[PDB]
Amino acid sequence: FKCVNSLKEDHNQPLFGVQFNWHSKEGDPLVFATVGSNRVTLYECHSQGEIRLLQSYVDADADENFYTCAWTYDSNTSHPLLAVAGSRGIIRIINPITMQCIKHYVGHGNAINELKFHPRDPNLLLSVSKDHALRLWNIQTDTLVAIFGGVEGHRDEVLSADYDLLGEKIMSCGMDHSLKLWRINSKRMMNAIKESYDYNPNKTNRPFISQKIHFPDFSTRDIHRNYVDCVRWLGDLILSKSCENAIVCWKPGKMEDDIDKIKPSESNVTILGRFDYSQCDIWYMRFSMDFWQKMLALGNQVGKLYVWDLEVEDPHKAKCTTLTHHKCGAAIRQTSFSRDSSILIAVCDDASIWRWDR
Ligand SMILES: Cc1cccc(F)c1CN1C[C@H](c2ccc(-c3cnn(CC(N)=O)c3)cc2)[C@@H](N(C)C)C1
Numbered sequence: 001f002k003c004v005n006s007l008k009e010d011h012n013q014p015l016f017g018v019q020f021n022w023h024s025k026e027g028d029p030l031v032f033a034t035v036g037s038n039r040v041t042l043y044e045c046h047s048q049g050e051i052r053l054l055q056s057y058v059d060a061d062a063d064e065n066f067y068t069c070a071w072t073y074d075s076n077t078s079h080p081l082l083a084v085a086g087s088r089g090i091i092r093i094i095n096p097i098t099m100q101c102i103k104h105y106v107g108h109g110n111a112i113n114e115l116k117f118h119p120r121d122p123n124l125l126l127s128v129s130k131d132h133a134l135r136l137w138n139i140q141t142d143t144l145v146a147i148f149g150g151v152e153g154h155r156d157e158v159l160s161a162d163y164d165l166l167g168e169k170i171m172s173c174g175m176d177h178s179l180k181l182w183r184i185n186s187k188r189m190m191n192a193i194k195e196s197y198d199y200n201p202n203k204t205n206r207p208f209i210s211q212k213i214h215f216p217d218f219s220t221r222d223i224h225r226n227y228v229d230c231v232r233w234l235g236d237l238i239l240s241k242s243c244e245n246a247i248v249c250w251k252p253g254k255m256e257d258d259i260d261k262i263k264p265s266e267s268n269v270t271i272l273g274r275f276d277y278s279q280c281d282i283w284y285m286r287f288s289m290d291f292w293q294k295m296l297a298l299g300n301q302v303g304k305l306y307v308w309d310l311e312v313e314d315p316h317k318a319k320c321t322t323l324t325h326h327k328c329g330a331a332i333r334q335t336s337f338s339r340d341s342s343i344l345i346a347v348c349d350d351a352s353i354w355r356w357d358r
Helices: 187-198
Strands: 002-008 015-020 030-036 039-045 051-058 066-073 080-086 090-095 100-106 112-117 124-129 134-138 143-148 158-163 169-174 179-183 211-213 218-220 230-234 237-241 246-252 269-276 287-289 295-299 305-309 319-323 332-337 343-348 352-357
Touching (some): 015 343, 030 080, 030 343, 039 066, 039 080, 066 112, 080 112, 090 112, 124 158, 134 187, 143 187, 169 230, 169 237, 230 287, 287 332, 295 332, 295 343, 305 343
Parallel strands (some): 015 066, 015 332, 143 211, 158 230
Antiparallel strands (some): 002 352, 015 030, 030 039, 039 051, 080 090, 090 100, 112 124, 134 143, 158 169, 169 179, 179 218, 230 237, 246 269, 295 305, 305 319, 332 343, 343 352
């Protein structure tokens, strides 16, 4: 990787999120979105390092702070869609062509810290909230499918979550130091999703009933000792970090325990490795993976990038490379790989954007 360009957005506030559109059509240039201040902005990557500015969506409320975005597509038309959310607790579905807000969703109106789309169903959107809950939405029928919370749910802000490969289960994490597993391939949850697709408010009198899921299928506070701010599945294993200069690779149960036989009472975890780094001990810093999950990237609070090659026989054998540029000194909140892995974008607390090309 070599650094080929940078720019800075005019708001001078942190960019909290960046995502390449992995649903961009064949023959179209690569496009990524950034979120920070009260806006979302799209850029196109071109040759000779050019980052071409397209168009932003700017919230009507100057006090909105967007924290997260996620791409999907319209399941009928195939056209890409961009979901954004933040401090106002409003999910907006944006048409990236025109930057029009097509529609929006509100739960209880508390800050949304992350959005993720289901890996097999482009209509299923997961939000994680300052109010300690996760919410699963069906953006085809505009329904809240389920809320994941309760006293055995998270007891402080949820900061991150991730679906596994097939979208059979979710791992969430947050300010309570815990990582929690929620299965969504239960008979109850599969039925709820089916019913969400059968719901049309114009053809019935009932409101749509959301599931209240009050018990995770596994919980641990034994991995980290501070706010857990990013989580990703790596097959049946988990990658997660806190502010302790480490990403931990771990699994529920003992070494030979199958993830789908784990009981909610399981008290053990197994640590398969840990990737240490420096100067990333402030709260709220995300790591990202490429499409194939061959690579892992994390930026630190002084503008250094760490990239791990996970194409090795066991997690602890990961090979680290580091990327620095003398002008890049601000905290990197998130990174994104292009779908082909040829470009890595980093975004920063000073509103700067850094492009690295293979
Ligand atoms: C990015 C991220 C990463 C991982 C998990 C996550 F959940 C999030 C999302 N975060 C948005 C919120 C937030 C974070 C930072 C600031 C802030 C203010 N000033 N600065 C530095 C400056 N230089 O201005 C930074 C303000 C609000 C955090 N919540 C819990 C308070 C969660």
